[PDB]
Amino acid sequence: DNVEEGNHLYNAGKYQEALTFFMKPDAVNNPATMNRIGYMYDEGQGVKKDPKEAFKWYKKAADANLPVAQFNLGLMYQHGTGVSKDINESIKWFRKAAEQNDPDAEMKMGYLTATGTGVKKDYQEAIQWYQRAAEHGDSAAYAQIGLFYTLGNGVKKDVNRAVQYYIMGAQKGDARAQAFLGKAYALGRGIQPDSEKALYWYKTAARNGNVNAMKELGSIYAKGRLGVKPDQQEAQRWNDMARKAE
16 A cells, blocks of 8 residues: 555654655545645644645545544634634534544534534533543543533533543543542532542642642642641642643
8 A cells, every 4th residue: 555654654753755655646545645634734744834735635535524534624614724714614514524423523513512603502412412422432521511410501400410420531531520520529519528539630630731620739738728738849839830831
């Protein structure tokens, strides 16, 4: 294959070297490869980053019914990256990509439905899209669903069930569910108050770049909440890092 070779060179950072292989007649015609050429233009892997040119390759690949590339194409409309911003053409593509079972597109559809951005707001359709994106390997989806039960958007507030969703997403690497779960342990809101497990999950979410957990952590050590020995050598570490991250 001229694409599988070009994949090996690209997988190993020889982007321009890999790009020539992809531009070969047998390679260009591959839809998955056509998508990758748009990516390389989108991030400047082998070329000077041109999003407008990246749009050309996303459209070719998305016009071949490639779920990854229909999502990418819908993004380019939504942000108006390489085309002129068309929020409502963008949902044509997310819809196609999401109904083709793309996880990222299903969640973009959970968002657009929950906010009513390009479509009639519907908290019930938004849950379905979010739960479907969870089945397809998206850990952020769990906390997005649990928010509905904590807040009460289209459902009666079931704080117990919301924390069950947080724990799921928290144990699968999601920075926010981890912070949400830490707050649940800390107040006993969702489950049984554990000052240790609350601290563990706060530390894990901060480790994963959740700013509210960093800020929370800095407050924990300074005041001396949650049974830590009050430490300011740690407390000022966290708050500085949070400021630096915004």
